[PDB]
Protein backbone atom coordinates (compact mmCIF):
# COMPACT_ATOMS: atom_id res chain seq x y z
CA UNK A 1 0.00 0.00 0.00
CA UNK A 2 2.70 2.54 1.06
CA UNK A 3 6.15 2.91 2.58
CA UNK A 4 7.39 2.50 6.13
CA UNK A 5 10.92 4.06 6.42
CA UNK A 6 13.51 4.32 3.69
CA UNK A 7 17.27 4.60 2.95
CA UNK A 8 18.72 7.10 0.39
CA UNK A 9 17.69 5.41 -2.87
CA UNK A 10 14.42 4.33 -1.22
CA UNK A 11 13.68 8.05 -0.43
CA UNK A 12 14.56 9.17 -3.96
CA UNK A 13 12.31 6.51 -5.56
CA UNK A 14 9.56 7.63 -3.12
CA UNK A 15 9.81 11.36 -3.99
CA UNK A 16 8.88 10.66 -7.65
CA UNK A 17 6.12 8.20 -6.60
CA UNK A 18 4.54 10.84 -4.32
CA UNK A 19 4.82 13.39 -7.21
CA UNK A 20 3.14 10.80 -9.49
CA UNK A 21 0.41 10.09 -6.90
CA UNK A 22 -0.37 13.71 -5.93
CA UNK A 23 -0.93 14.56 -9.62
CA UNK A 24 -2.51 11.20 -10.56
CA UNK A 25 -5.26 11.71 -7.98
CA UNK A 26 -6.75 14.46 -10.13
CA UNK A 27 -9.47 13.18 -12.45
CA UNK A 28 -10.19 9.54 -11.69
CA UNK A 29 -8.16 7.17 -9.68
CA UNK A 30 -4.84 7.95 -8.00
CA UNK A 31 -3.33 4.55 -8.95
CA UNK A 32 -3.45 5.49 -12.71
CA UNK A 33 -2.36 8.58 -14.65
CA UNK A 34 -5.30 10.11 -16.53
CA UNK A 35 -5.02 12.70 -19.38
CA UNK A 36 -5.54 15.83 -17.43
CA UNK A 37 -3.00 14.71 -14.85
CA UNK A 38 -0.38 13.59 -17.34
CA UNK A 39 -0.54 16.69 -19.54
CA UNK A 40 -0.63 18.77 -16.33
CA UNK A 41 2.52 16.94 -15.08
CA UNK A 42 4.46 17.60 -18.28
CA UNK A 43 3.16 21.17 -18.57
CA UNK A 44 3.77 21.99 -14.88
CA UNK A 45 6.48 19.67 -13.53
CA UNK A 46 8.62 18.47 -16.52
CA UNK A 47 8.53 21.36 -19.04
CA UNK A 48 12.24 22.27 -19.29
CA UNK A 49 13.30 18.60 -19.33
CA UNK A 50 10.50 17.18 -21.47
CA UNK A 51 10.81 19.97 -24.04
CA UNK A 52 7.76 18.61 -25.85
CA UNK A 53 4.93 19.23 -23.44
CA UNK A 54 3.00 20.01 -26.65
CA UNK A 55 2.94 16.59 -28.35
CA UNK A 56 2.46 14.70 -25.05
CA UNK A 57 -0.22 12.74 -26.97
CA UNK A 58 2.52 10.89 -28.93
CA UNK A 59 4.37 10.00 -25.71
CA UNK A 60 0.99 8.97 -24.19
CA UNK A 61 0.28 6.65 -27.14
CA UNK A 62 3.85 5.26 -26.88
CA UNK A 63 3.47 4.80 -23.09
CA UNK A 64 -0.08 3.43 -22.78
CA UNK A 65 0.34 0.65 -25.27
CA UNK A 66 -2.59 -1.50 -24.07
CA UNK A 67 -4.29 1.83 -25.00
CA UNK A 68 -6.87 1.55 -22.19
CA UNK A 69 -5.82 5.21 -21.68
CA UNK A 70 -5.18 4.58 -18.01
CA UNK A 71 -1.46 5.34 -17.92
CA UNK A 72 -0.96 2.39 -15.61
CA UNK A 73 1.25 1.82 -12.53
CA UNK A 74 4.19 0.92 -14.82
CA UNK A 75 3.12 2.06 -18.04
CA UNK A 76 3.53 5.63 -16.70
CA UNK A 77 6.82 4.98 -14.92
CA UNK A 78 8.60 4.73 -18.32
CA UNK A 79 8.32 8.56 -18.54
CA UNK A 80 10.66 9.04 -15.55
CA UNK A 81 12.97 6.70 -17.55
CA UNK A 82 12.84 8.79 -20.63
CA UNK A 83 13.70 11.91 -18.60
CA UNK A 84 16.38 9.85 -16.78
CA UNK A 85 18.11 8.93 -20.05
CA UNK A 86 17.24 12.34 -21.72
CA UNK A 87 19.77 14.15 -19.49
CA UNK A 88 22.40 11.89 -21.16
CA UNK A 89 20.46 11.24 -24.40
CA UNK A 90 19.54 14.50 -26.24
CA UNK A 91 17.42 12.74 -28.96
CA UNK A 92 19.37 9.74 -30.11
CA UNK A 93 16.96 6.81 -29.53
CA UNK A 94 15.17 6.07 -32.82
CA UNK A 95 14.32 2.31 -32.64
CA UNK A 96 11.51 0.59 -34.62
CA UNK A 97 10.53 -3.02 -33.81
CA UNK A 98 7.35 -5.17 -33.76
CA UNK B 1 23.90 32.53 -7.97
CA UNK B 2 25.03 30.02 -10.38
CA UNK B 3 24.19 26.71 -8.69
CA UNK B 4 20.67 27.17 -10.04
CA UNK B 5 17.99 24.69 -8.85
CA UNK B 6 16.26 22.63 -11.55
CA UNK B 7 12.68 21.28 -11.61
CA UNK B 8 11.70 18.70 -8.95
CA UNK B 9 11.81 15.88 -11.50
CA UNK B 10 15.22 17.06 -12.92
CA UNK B 11 16.57 17.07 -9.32
CA UNK B 12 15.27 13.55 -8.68
CA UNK B 13 16.37 11.99 -12.02
CA UNK B 14 19.82 13.52 -11.47
CA UNK B 15 20.25 12.21 -7.89
CA UNK B 16 19.47 8.63 -9.03
CA UNK B 17 21.45 9.04 -12.31
CA UNK B 18 24.61 10.14 -10.42
CA UNK B 19 24.17 7.20 -7.98
CA UNK B 20 23.69 4.87 -10.98
CA UNK B 21 26.74 6.38 -12.70
CA UNK B 22 29.20 5.91 -9.81
CA UNK B 23 28.29 2.19 -10.02
CA UNK B 24 28.08 2.22 -13.87
CA UNK B 25 31.77 3.23 -13.92
CA UNK B 26 32.94 0.63 -11.29
CA UNK B 27 33.85 -1.97 -13.94
CA UNK B 28 34.08 -1.90 -17.78
CA UNK B 29 31.87 0.58 -19.68
CA UNK B 30 30.73 3.66 -17.72
CA UNK B 31 27.08 3.09 -18.75
CA UNK B 32 26.49 -0.63 -18.27
CA UNK B 33 26.39 -2.33 -14.88
CA UNK B 34 27.89 -5.81 -15.20
CA UNK B 35 26.87 -8.59 -12.76
CA UNK B 36 29.01 -7.59 -9.74
CA UNK B 37 28.50 -3.85 -10.50
CA UNK B 38 24.75 -4.47 -10.46
CA UNK B 39 24.83 -6.54 -7.26
CA UNK B 40 26.81 -3.74 -5.55
CA UNK B 41 23.75 -1.41 -5.80
CA UNK B 42 21.41 -3.77 -4.00
CA UNK B 43 24.06 -5.06 -1.60
CA UNK B 44 25.23 -1.57 -0.61
CA UNK B 45 22.20 0.72 -0.73
CA UNK B 46 18.93 -1.30 -1.05
CA UNK B 47 18.35 -3.41 2.13
CA UNK B 48 14.65 -2.72 2.86
CA UNK B 49 13.22 -2.26 -0.65
CA UNK B 50 14.21 -5.56 -2.30
CA UNK B 51 15.22 -7.58 0.77
CA UNK B 52 16.94 -10.24 -1.36
CA UNK B 53 20.59 -9.63 -1.93
CA UNK B 54 20.61 -13.44 -2.46
CA UNK B 55 18.87 -14.21 -5.78
CA UNK B 56 20.23 -11.16 -7.56
CA UNK B 57 20.55 -13.61 -10.50
CA UNK B 58 16.72 -13.69 -10.73
CA UNK B 59 16.57 -9.88 -10.85
CA UNK B 60 19.44 -9.85 -13.39
CA UNK B 61 17.63 -12.31 -15.71
CA UNK B 62 14.33 -10.41 -15.20
CA UNK B 63 16.14 -7.13 -16.09
CA UNK B 64 18.72 -7.99 -18.78
CA UNK B 65 16.20 -9.28 -21.37
CA UNK B 66 19.03 -9.85 -23.91
CA UNK B 67 21.25 -11.55 -21.26
CA UNK B 68 24.44 -9.76 -22.44
CA UNK B 69 25.56 -9.44 -18.76
CA UNK B 70 25.49 -5.65 -19.14
CA UNK B 71 22.55 -3.70 -17.75
CA UNK B 72 22.91 -0.66 -20.09
CA UNK B 73 21.55 2.65 -18.65
CA UNK B 74 17.97 1.94 -19.85
CA UNK B 75 18.14 -1.77 -18.87
CA UNK B 76 19.45 -0.96 -15.37
CA UNK B 77 16.81 1.76 -15.17
CA UNK B 78 14.16 -1.07 -15.11
CA UNK B 79 15.14 -1.72 -11.47
CA UNK B 80 14.05 1.84 -10.53
CA UNK B 81 10.55 0.89 -11.73
CA UNK B 82 10.46 -2.22 -9.64
CA UNK B 83 11.66 -0.01 -6.74
CA UNK B 84 9.11 2.80 -7.40
CA UNK B 85 6.51 0.04 -7.71
CA UNK B 86 7.65 -1.92 -4.56
CA UNK B 87 7.49 1.18 -2.30
CA UNK B 88 3.71 1.28 -3.03
CA UNK B 89 3.13 -2.34 -4.07
CA UNK B 90 5.41 -4.03 -1.87
CA UNK B 91 3.61 -7.41 -1.30
CA UNK B 92 -0.05 -6.18 -1.76
CA UNK B 93 -1.27 -9.78 -1.75
CA UNK B 94 -0.02 -10.97 1.69
CA UNK B 95 1.80 -7.99 3.29
CA UNK B 96 0.03 -5.41 3.84
CA UNK B 97 1.83 -2.77 4.07
CA UNK B 98 3.84 -0.52 5.29
CA1 LIG C 1 -5.74 9.48 -12.31
CA1 LIG D 1 -2.76 1.97 -20.44
CA1 LIG E 1 30.39 -0.73 -15.92
CA1 LIG F 1 21.84 -6.02 -21.57
Nearest residue to A86 (alpha-carbon basis) of B78, B15, B81, B13: B13
Kindly list the residues from chain A whose CB atom is less than 8 angstroms away from the CB atom of residue B15: 12
For residue B94, how many C-alpha atoms fall within 13 Å in the half-sphere facing its CB? 0
Query: Cβ separation of A2 and B77 shorter than 8 Å?
Result: no
Q: For residues B39 and B53, is the Cβ–Cβ distance under 8 A?
A: yes
3-state secondary structure of B70: coil
Q: What is the DSSP letter of A22?
A: H
CA distance B60 to chain A (A): 18
CA distance A43 to chain B (A): 12
Pairwise CA distance, residues B47 & B68, whole Å: 26
- Which domains are assigned to chain A? 1-98 (1.10.238.10)
Amino acid sequence: MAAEPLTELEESIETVVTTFFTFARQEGRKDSLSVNEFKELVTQQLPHLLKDVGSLDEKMKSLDVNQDSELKFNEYWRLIGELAKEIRKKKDLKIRKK
